[PDB]
Each structure stands twice: as structure tokens, then as C-alpha cells.
Amino acid sequence: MIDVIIAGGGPTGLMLAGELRLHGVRTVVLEKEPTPNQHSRSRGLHARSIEVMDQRGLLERFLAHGEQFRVGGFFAGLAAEWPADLDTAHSYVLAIPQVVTERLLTEHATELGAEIRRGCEVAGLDQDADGVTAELADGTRLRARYLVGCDGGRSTVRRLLGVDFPGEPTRVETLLADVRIDVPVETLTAVVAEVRKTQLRFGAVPAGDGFFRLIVPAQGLSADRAAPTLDELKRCLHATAGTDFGVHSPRWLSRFGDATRLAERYRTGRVLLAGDAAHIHPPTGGQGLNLGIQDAFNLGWKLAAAIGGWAPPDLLDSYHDERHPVAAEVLDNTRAQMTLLSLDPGPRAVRRLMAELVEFPDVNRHLIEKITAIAVRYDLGDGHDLVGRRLRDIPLTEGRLYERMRGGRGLLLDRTGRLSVSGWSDRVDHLADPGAALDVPAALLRPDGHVAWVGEDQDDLLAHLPRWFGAAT
Amino acid sequence: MIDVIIAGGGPTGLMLAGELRLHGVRTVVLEKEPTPNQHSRSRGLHARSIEVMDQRGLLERFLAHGEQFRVGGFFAGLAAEWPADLDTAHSYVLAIPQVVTERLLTEHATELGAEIRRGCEVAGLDQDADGVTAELADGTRLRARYLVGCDGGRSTVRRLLGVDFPGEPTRVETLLADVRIDVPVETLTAVVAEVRKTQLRFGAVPAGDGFFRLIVPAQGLSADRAAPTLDELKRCLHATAGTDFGVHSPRWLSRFGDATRLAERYRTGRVLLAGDAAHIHPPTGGQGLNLGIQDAFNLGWKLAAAIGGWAPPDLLDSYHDERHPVAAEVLDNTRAQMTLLSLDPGPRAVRRLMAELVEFPDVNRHLIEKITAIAVRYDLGDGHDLVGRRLRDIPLTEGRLYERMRGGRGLLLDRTGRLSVSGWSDRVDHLADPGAALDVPAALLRPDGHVAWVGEDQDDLLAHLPRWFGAAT
Ligand SMILES: Cc1cc2nc3c(=O)[nH]c(=O)nc-3n(C[C@H](O)[C@H](O)[C@H](O)COP(=O)(O)OP(=O)(O)OC[C@H]3O[C@@H](n4cnc5c(N)ncnc54)[C@H](O)[C@@H]3O)c2cc1C
Numbered sequence: 001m002i003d004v005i006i007a008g009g010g011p012t013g014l015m016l017a018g019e020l021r022l023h024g025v026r027t028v029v030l031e032k033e034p035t036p037n038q039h040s041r042s043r044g045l046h047a048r049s050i051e052v053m054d055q056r057g058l059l060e061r062f063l064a065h066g067e068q069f070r071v072g073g074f075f076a077g078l079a080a081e082w083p084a085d086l087d088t089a090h091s092y093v094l095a096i097p098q099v100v101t102e103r104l105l106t107e108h109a110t111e112l113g114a115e116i117r118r119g120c121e122v123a124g125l126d127q128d129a130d131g132v133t134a135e136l137a138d139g140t141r142l143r144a145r146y147l148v149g150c151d152g153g154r155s156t157v158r159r160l161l162g163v164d165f166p167g168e169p170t171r172v173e174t175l176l177a178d179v180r181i182d183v184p185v186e187t188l189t190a191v192v193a194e195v196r197k198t199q200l201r202f203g204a205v206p207a208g209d210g211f212f213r214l215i216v217p218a219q220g221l222s223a224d225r226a227a228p229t230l231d232e233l234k235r236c237l238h239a240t241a242g243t244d245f246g247v248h249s250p251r252w253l254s255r256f257g258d259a260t261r262l263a264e265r266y267r268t269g270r271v272l273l274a275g276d277a278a279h280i281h282p283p284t285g286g287q288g289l290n291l292g293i294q295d296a297f298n299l300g301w302k303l304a305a306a307i308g309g310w311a312p313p314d315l316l317d318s319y320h321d322e323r324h325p326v327a328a329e330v331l332d333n334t335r336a337q338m339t340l341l342s343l344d345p346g347p348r349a350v351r352r353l354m355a356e357l358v359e360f361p362d363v364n365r366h367l368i369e370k371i372t373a374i375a376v377r378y379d380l381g382d383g384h385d386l387v388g389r390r391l392r393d394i395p396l397t398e399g400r401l402y403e404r405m406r407g408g409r410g411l412l413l414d415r416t417g418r419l420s421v422s423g424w425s426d427r428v429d430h431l432a433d434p435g436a437a438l439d440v441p442a443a444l445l446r447p448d449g450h451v452a453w454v455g456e457d458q459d460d461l462l463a464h465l466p467r468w469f470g471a472a473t
Numbered sequence: 474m475i476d477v478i479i480a481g482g483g484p485t486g487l488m489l490a491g492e493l494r495l496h497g498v499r500t501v502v503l504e505k506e507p508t509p510n511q512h513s514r515s516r517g518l519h520a521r522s523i524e525v526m527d528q529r530g531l532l533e534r535f536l537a538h539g540e541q542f543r544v545g546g547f548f549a550g551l552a553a554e555w556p557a558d559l560d561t562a563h564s565y566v567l568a569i570p571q572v573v574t575e576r577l578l579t580e581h582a583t584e585l586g587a588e589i590r591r592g593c594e595v596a597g598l599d600q601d602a603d604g605v606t607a608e609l610a611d612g613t614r615l616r617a618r619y620l621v622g623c624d625g626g627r628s629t630v631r632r633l634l635g636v637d638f639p640g641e642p643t644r645v646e647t648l649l650a651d652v653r654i655d656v657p658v659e660t661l662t663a664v665v666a667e668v669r670k671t672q673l674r675f676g677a678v679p680a681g682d683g684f685f686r687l688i689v690p691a692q693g694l695s696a697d698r699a700a701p702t703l704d705e706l707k708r709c710l711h712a713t714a715g716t717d718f719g720v721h722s723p724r725w726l727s728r729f730g731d732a733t734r735l736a737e738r739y740r741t742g743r744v745l746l747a748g749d750a751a752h753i754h755p756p757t758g759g760q761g762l763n764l765g766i767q768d769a770f771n772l773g774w775k776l777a778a779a780i781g782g783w784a785p786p787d788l789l790d791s792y793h794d795e796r797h798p799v800a801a802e803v804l805d806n807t808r809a810q811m812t813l814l815s816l817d818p819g820p821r822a823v824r825r826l827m828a829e830l831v832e833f834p835d836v837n838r839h840l841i842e843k844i845t846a847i848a849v850r851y852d853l854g855d856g857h858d859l860v861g862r863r864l865r866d867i868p869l870t871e872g873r874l875y876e877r878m879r880g881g882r883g884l885l886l887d888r889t890g891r892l893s894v895s896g897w898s899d900r901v902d903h904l905a906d907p908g909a910a911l912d913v914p915a916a917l918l919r920p921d922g923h924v925a926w927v928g929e930d931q932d933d934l935l936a937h938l939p940r941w942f943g944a945a946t
């Protein structure tokens with residue numbers, strides 16, 4: 001029997017598939033497209049995702065396929081420098097196109113034994129006390145214990161579950177086009193800089209083969225929501241830039257709206273949602289793929305614990321509880337960034353103010369910690385300030401913390417010489433290293449790297465172990 | 474002959490009148506209303522104005538008539554605490570009603586010998602190479618050397634000069650009403666707090682005689698711009714608060730718009746503009762009266778120098794040059810604050826972000842330094858960071874710096890034991906005090922307290938003296 005079916009083999013589904021396979025969960029990914037999508041949305045990973053890749057031994061291959069940037073501009077285009085003191089060992093943006101990210105994640109899930117089935121479109125579902133059935137559009141059916149809808153912003157699974165998707169509708173649309181041009185790049189660049197004085201929803205990024213990615217505001221809102229024609233792209237370039245640059249030969253035409261919507265329940269019985277299936281928002285700040293990877297990283301070890309039979313009874317519900325608030329904050333911060341890009345005089349004045357404020361290092365750091373997700377803190381109810389936050393990478397006596405996390409178990413980082421995870425050692429590794437560079441006596445880490453407990457008293461540690469790791473054996 | 478006619482005896486005109494009388498300028502204020510206005514707009518003075526009053530020996534009487542506050546909320550209502558480290562010796566808001574401010578300024582101008590003429594409405598003007606004629610609406614005429622329009626936001630003088638008043642039109646109107654209510658104050662307070670969760674353009678402030686000042690958004694924009702009726706106030710209270718509180722017996726009804734307009738030229742020959750006559754904007758942050766007092770404080774000693782015959786040829790033009798940019802920044806910051814009060818979801822998201830940022834002390838300080846005008850810096854072209862800024866009050870060996878400024882002359886604060894203002898001592902006092910708590914060798918202060926020069930070399934000091942103080946005698 002299949003343990004988990006994943007509907008959708010985008011970055012979220014593929015990441016989830018890898019996390020599940022770490023625990024020997026039998027995982028089948030049903031991806032509707034017969035061949036990988038060739039057009040990239042995402043342009044890169046942010047620090048929390050880069051950390052996550054390094055905790056799973058994937059960072060070397062991501063670095064080998066991308067370029068590291070430390071530049072300003074990630075929060076609503078607000079120019080700065082990169083913050084000097086961001087609290088991560090991975091303080092950069094990894095520019096890497098989404099197609100490449102999906103290739104790396106695909107090759108990793110496949111090598112861990114996930115079964116990826118392309119050309120398989122989930123059309124229907126049926127669940128009961130014991131499992132879930134997925135019905136494919138070709139009439140075939142698959143049974144598993146759980147089903148996770150990782151099937152993007154127009155998720156079939158979300159619709160079939162009848163999960164509400166409340167939020168703000170699209171009010172502002174933007175065109176995206178991969179096109180050739182008929183002006184020299186220096187001419188394109190000169191005009192773009194003049195426009196971007198005021199309209200920051202505009203630009204042109206070379207693909208390095210003579211094509212350019214043009215971003216240009218739409219005129220109004222479209223009834224269809226269909227992709228724009230070349231004719232509409234030209235009208236929009238004329239309106240914003242005063243020229244269409246002789247654009248021709250499009251190889252991709254797209255439109256995106258600024259709606260911010262969040263699934264009301266991430267879990268419905270044995271079916272969950274993750275990634276764009278659970279939340280949509282503007283690309284301002286480059287956050288969605290990152291958010292989805294982190295959804296998968298939250299969910300995977302929990303679902304694995306439930307399949308393994310040791311998950312405490314509330315564990316799976318803690319996926320919604322922790323991740324739904326996080327997405328709500330991304331959605332809000334993208335509403336704020338879109339307002340900072342508005343040409344209306346009030347917003348332009350607020351933008352000038354924000355430009356003054358981001359010269360303060362605390363502000364610049366705050367906005368980038370927000371964007372890059374390194375300061376996410378779940379409410380795991382304790383006082384100690386580290387509890388609920390992920391722990392950054394730190395040097396050990398030999399090596400580093402993230403090197404020890406590649407199995408995806410919990411980890412007790414113990415500097416006291418005195419604690420013990422006996423009873424849970426099959427689920428929690430004991431990293432007994434007084435030399436570790438972390439100024440607490442000990443920290444219990446969940447498999448997602450978030451701190452569940454900080455302290456130095458064995459009895460207290462025994463009290464917190466079952467919450468995340470179930471019963472002693 | 475009259476030296477200066479001031480059109481308008483509001484706070485700006487009255488302050489200007491006092492500054493001029495310090496120098497024996499013959500000053501006549503033509504105020505159109507026969508009796509003082511009884512309704513207050515302004516609720517208080519900000520730190521730069523409080524400093525200015527203390528440099529002119531008026532602070533004791535302002536403090537005796539007002540209440541000192543150190544509370545958050547002055548930038549778009551963003552709750553904080555008052556910033557701990559604001560760079561002023563006068564770190565507070567002086568709550569004092571505008572009527573009282575005008576009384577104090579009137580009694581001060583009158584005691585210095587300004588001639589205030591109430592019931593005198595400027596209707597027309599005529600200037601030539603030698604002077605200006607003001608024509609009053611009763612057909613009488615007065616001649617002076619200069620005329621300053623201090624005649625408010627619908628300035629007659631600005632209109633007669635044909636000075637453009639460009640900017641953003643009113644898009645958002647607010648009602649103001651001094652009314653009695655028919656609910657207990659605790660009920661009023663409870664509803665206002667519920668509304669102010671989201672609508673911060675709403676409130677109710679007791680006058681202490683059973684009347685309340687109610688602030689409530691208008692519905693739309695009015696064609697007349699006329700004062701609202703009680704009926705319109707009720708409609709607006711119902712819409713915003715769900716109740717009109719039984720408001721009755723209005724003693725004042727007003728409406729104000731959010732237009733931001735700035736006179737294109739502060740000076741037209743022998744006629745200048747100051748105060749609301751030169752700029753209008755929202756009351757967000759409580760800045761207009763303050764800005765006007767500071768306009769007068771910039772202009773007065775300069776006009777006095779021109780009347781006295783020693784002003785360098787560019788001096789009077791430096792009023793426009795210095796003060797026009799300052800007003801432009803107030804106008805912009807009020808556009809930003811109004812946006813932060815908008816109920817639209819984008820602005821609400823930007824407001825939540827700003828609420829996070831103002832917890833950083835640098836941000837809170839930055840916004841309050843902006844509001845209170847203490848960080849205004851004129852471009853007087855040097856490098857030294859103090860040049861162009863006002864100098865805060867500082868302790869002397871005995872006493873304090875602001876105690877020595879009450880004559881309204883320049884002031885060389887010299888710690889070196891070696892400098893000299895000989896040649897200019899009738900215009901610049903030499904405060905030779907190595908014990909003064911200021912970490913520069915010496916600072917030359919203009920009569921408005923702004924630093925013209927910092928250094929320690931007599932020859933260099935001689936080079937900068939004529940720019941502000943004319944030729945040696
Ligand atoms: C213009 C733009 C730029 C962006 N830039 C960035 C960025 O720089 N950084 C960032 O982090 N994010 C970025 N994003 C957001 C990012 O692209 C998405 O958040 C990311 O694709 C979400 O991945 P996902 O796996 O959840 O969903 P998707 O990538 O949509 O994948 C869903 C998968 O489901 C398959 N599927 C759909 N229906 C079914 C079905 N019924 N059965 C089976 N399979 C199905 C689809 O074929 C697809 O492969 C950007 C978005 C836009 C529009």
C-alpha cells in the first residue's frame with residue numbers, strides 16, 4: 001500500500017516527497033504534466049530555504065547551479081545594501097531559476113525512492129476513517145493513508161475538499177513576457193531606468209540567449225485572466241514606457257494578479273494542503289516557493305511520524321497551527337509591498353519615508369529577516385526566546401550543526417555533559433558537545449530545526465520530549 | 474513711515490511682529506477680525522517651537538498656560554512611547570490651545586510695540602521699487618517698505634500676487650464639531666475605542682465644560698466646502714460609529730480637507746508670504762502652526778537686516794530658499810501619514826509594518842525628530858555636520874545658551890579663547906566661554922539659532938561673517 005499520495009510535483013510536492021522518503025514512507029507523486037515545465041517563475045532561494053537545503057545535504061548541488069547575491073532591493077525594491085548582521089550562517093540570496101530548482105528537487109526525491117508519475121491528473125478524491133482514494137482523470141484510482149494537495153494556486157484538491165480560500169481579490173495585474181527586442185540592450189536599459197524612477201513594477205531581465213523577461217503593468221483588470229497577447233503587451237509597454245522596444249517572437253506570455261488568499265484549513269481529515277495550494281500572493285520579495293518548501297519541511301516529519309505510528313495525537317494538527325499564521329504574514333507583507341509600489345501620491349510619500357527608514361540597520365535587517373523567513377517563530381508556548389525559532393547553523397567541536405541533521409530526526413544539542421534522550425534515541429539523536437558555539441545549556445530541536453525546549457534539567461527535558469516525539473520506548 | 478505691514482494677526486503674523494520689534498522695526502499688523510477668534514485648531518507646540526519661545530524669553534509664560542506631554546502617537550497615531558533620546562533640551566509636547574497661543578503672542582507683540590489693528594482687511598496691494606501700498610476694504614491705504622502676507626490658507630496676498638499654489642487637491646475630508654452629547658463619557662469612550670481599532674480619523678476630546686470636540690470622516694467630498702450641518706455630522710457619526718451619541722447644540726462646526734499645496738515663490742519683490750499663506754496640509758502630526766512660527770523666526774531678523782540697511786544682497790532670498798524645502802517636506806510627510814490612516818487593505822498592511830518598525834528606537838526618534846522639526850537642516854553648503862542645523866540649548870559656565878539669545882542678534886559661541894567678532898559686534902554677540910558644553914572649538918549662530926560656521930581659525934571666521942551679517946563697520 002502507498003502511504004502518502006502527493007498531488008502535484010512542483011517544488012512543494014517534490015520537497016515533501018524527499019522529506020517523507022527520509023523515513024521510508026512510501027510516497028507517490030502524481031504530476032499532471034507529461035514533461036517538466038520549461039518556464040521559470042521563481043528566481044531563487046532565500047536564507048531560510050538555503051539553510052533547509054543544507055540541513056538535508058542539498059546545499060552543495062544548489063550552490064553548484066546558482067549564483068550567490070548580497071544586494072539590496074528585496075523589500076518592495078527598497079534599495080539598500082544587504083544587511084551586514086543578518087542572524088544566519090547563510091546570509092545571501094541564491095539566484096537559481098525555478099526550473100533548475102525543480103530539477104534538483106526531482107533528482108533528489110527520485111534518488112531517495114519517491115515514485116514520480118507524470119501525466120497523472122488528480123480529478124477526484126474520497127476519504128474515510130482508514131485512508132484516501134485519489135481518482136485520476138483517466139479513470140484509474142490510487143489508495144493511500146494520506147493525500148497532500150501540492151497542486152498549486154488553483155488547487156484541485158482544495159476545491160474538492162470545499163476549503164474556503166478567503167482574502168483580498170486581485171486589484172492590480174502585471175504582464176510577464178519572455179520576448180526578443182529590436183533595440184540595443186543599452187537603449188533598453190536607459191529607458192527602463194527612467195521608468196523605474198517611479199514605476200517599479202517594470203523591468204527587463206536578459207535570459208542570455210537574446211530573449212528578455214519583461215515585466216510591465218497591465219491596463220486595468222482582465223475578464224478572462226487569460227495570458228496576454230503580444231498586442232496587449234505592446235499596448236502596456238507603450239503606456240508605461242512610451243515605446244514597445246520592437247518586442248517580437250514571444251516564447252512565454254503570462255499575467256499575474258495581486259490577490260492574497262489563504263486556505264481556511266490546511267488539514268481536512270486525511271487530506272492536507274501545502275504550497276500555493278494553501279496560499280497565493282504577489283511575487284514581491286520572492287517568497288512563495290520559499291514558503292512552500294518550508295511548508296513541506298514542517299509537514300514531512302510529522303506525516304512520517306503519523307505513518308510510523310508514534311506521532312502524538314495533536315502532532316499533525318500542529319502543521320496548520322504553525323504554518324497558517326506564517327502564510328498570513330507573508331500575504332500581509334506582500335500587500336504592504338504592493339502599496340509601496342503604487343503610483344498614487346500617498347503611497348509615493350510613504351515609500352519616500354520607508355526609504356529613509358531602511359537606512360537604519362535595524363530596519364533593513366528587520367525587513368530582510370521578514371522576507372527570508374529566518375525569524376519565523378512558532379508559538380510553542382515557553383518563555384525562552386529561542387523556543388519556536390529555528391536554530392541557525394553553529395560550529396561544533398568538529399564540523400557544524402547542520403551536518404548532523406541529514407537523517408531528519410530530532411536532535412538534542414547538549415552542552416551539559418548530563419542529559420539523556422534514552423527512551424527516544426530512535427527518534428532523537430543526542431549531540432553531546434560542550435564545545436558547540438551556542439550559549440544555552442542544551443536545546444531540543446524538532447526534525448525541522450525549530451527549538452522545542454531549552455534547559456539543563458533532565459527531568460524537565462523528559463517532560464518536553466513526548467510533546468513532539470511521542471511515548472518512550 | 475511704517476517699515477513692515479503684516480497682513481493677518483494669526484500666530485504667524487504675531488510671531489513675526491514680535492521678531493521685527495526686537496530690532497525696532499516699525500510694524501503694523503492688519504487683522505481683519507474685530508475680536509479674537511474663539512475656536513482653537515492647534516492643540517500645542519512641538520519641541521522646535523518650544524525652543525524658539527525659550528530663545529525669546531517666552532517659554533515661562535507658555536509653560537504657565539499649557540501642559541507638558543511625553544506620549545506616543547504623534548506620527549499617524551502610531552502608538553509608542555515618547556523617544557527617550559530626542560536631541561533637544563526641550564523634549565516634550567506643550568499642549569496649549571491655539572486661542573491661548575495667539576493671546577500670548579498678541580500680548581508679547583503689543584508689549585514690544587507692534588501696532589495691531591483689528592477690523593482691518595487687506596483688499597488690494599501695489600508695490601514699486603521703493604515700497605508697498607496696502608489697500609484696505611474700507612478704502613483706506615497704508616504704505617510700508619515691505620508687506621508680509623500672514624493671512625492664512627486662503628491668503629488674499631498670495632492671490633493678489635498671482636503666486637501659484639501647486640500641489641495635491643483635497644481627496645479626503647474630515648468633520649470637526651464642538652458639541653454636547655447625550656451619552657455618559659464612559660459610553661462615548663468605549664465606542665470611540667472600538668472605532669479607533671481601525672478608523673483613526675475619529676475621536677472625541679472633552680473641552681471640560683460639557684462640550685466635546687468630535688472628529689469624524691466626511692462622506693465623500695463636498696461641493697460647497699461649507700461647514701457641515703448638524704444633520705451631516707449625525708450622518709457621518711452614524712456611518713463611522715453606528716450612533717450619533719445624541720449630539721446636539723453645536724458651538725462650532727467645521728470641515729477640513731487633506732490638500733497639500735505650497736506657494737511657488739515665498740517672495741515677490743517687496744511682498745513675502747509666511748505661515749498657511751505659503752503652505753497648507755493635513756493636521757496629522759500637529760505641524761502647521763509650528764511651521765508658521767518657524768517661518769516667522771527665519772524671516773524676521775532677515776527683514777530687520779534689510780530695513781536696517783546692512784543685509785547682504787542675497788539675504789532676503791534665503792528665506793524662500795531655506796523655508797520652501799522645509800514646508801515641502803512637511804507636506805509630503807502629511808501625505809504619508811494620511812495614507813497610514815486609510816482603511817484600504819494595502820495601507821492597513823503598510824500601517825501594521827510601520828507599527829513594527831516604530832518599536833525600533835531609531836525609527837521612533839526619526840519620526841518624532843521629523844514632526845517636531847528639530848532636525849531641519851538648511852543647505853548652508855559647508856561640510857561640518859552642525860552647519861545648517863539649529864543648535865540645541867546647552868549649559869554655559871553659568872546659565873544656558875538660550876538665555877543669551879533674547880536680543881535676537883547673532884552669537885559666536887567661542888570656546889577657544891582666541892576668536893573675535895570685532896567689526897560686527899553690533900550684530901553678533903561674542904559668547905566667550907571655554908566651559909560651554911559643546912564639542913566644537915566655536916560655532917557662529919544666526920539670529921534664528923542655526924549654525925552658519927564651525928571652526929577655530931579667526932581668518933576663516935572672518936570669511937564667513939559677511940554672508941549672514943553684511944559688511945564690517
Ligand atoms: C512572476 C512570479 C515570480 C515569482 N518569483 C518567486 C521567487 O523568486 N521566489 C519564490 O520563493 N517564489 C516566487 N514565486 C512564487 C513561486 O513560483 C510559487 O510559490 C511556487 O511555484 C509554488 O510551488 P508549488 O509546488 O506549491 O506549486 P506550483 O509550482 O504551482 O506546482 C503545482 C504542481 O501541481 C501540478 N498540478 C496542478 N493540478 C494538478 C492535479 N489536479 N493533479 C496533479 N498535478 C496537478 C501542476 O502541474 C504543478 O506542477 C513567483 C511567482 C510569480 C508569479
Ligand SMILES: Cc1cc2nc3c(=O)[nH]c(=O)nc-3n(C[C@H](O)[C@H](O)[C@H](O)COP(=O)(O)OP(=O)(O)OC[C@H]3O[C@@H](n4cnc5c(N)ncnc54)[C@H](O)[C@@H]3O)c2cc1C
Pocket residue numbers: 480481482483484485486503504505506514515516517518571593594595596623624625626628629630649729747748749750756758759760761762763764765
Ligand atoms: C483641525 C486642525 C488642527 C490643527 N492642529 C495643529 C496643531 O496641533 N499644531 C500645529 O502646529 N498646527 C495645527 N494646525 C495647523 C494650524 O491651525 C495653522 O497652521 C495655523 O493657524 C497657521 O497660522 P497662520 O497665522 O499662518 O494662519 P491663520 O491662523 O489662518 O491666521 C491668518 C489670519 O489672517 C487674517 N486674515 C485673513 N485674510 C486677511 C486679510 N485679507 N486681511 C487681514 N487679515 C486677514 C485671519 O483673520 C487670521 O487671523 C491644525 C489645523 C487644523 C485644521
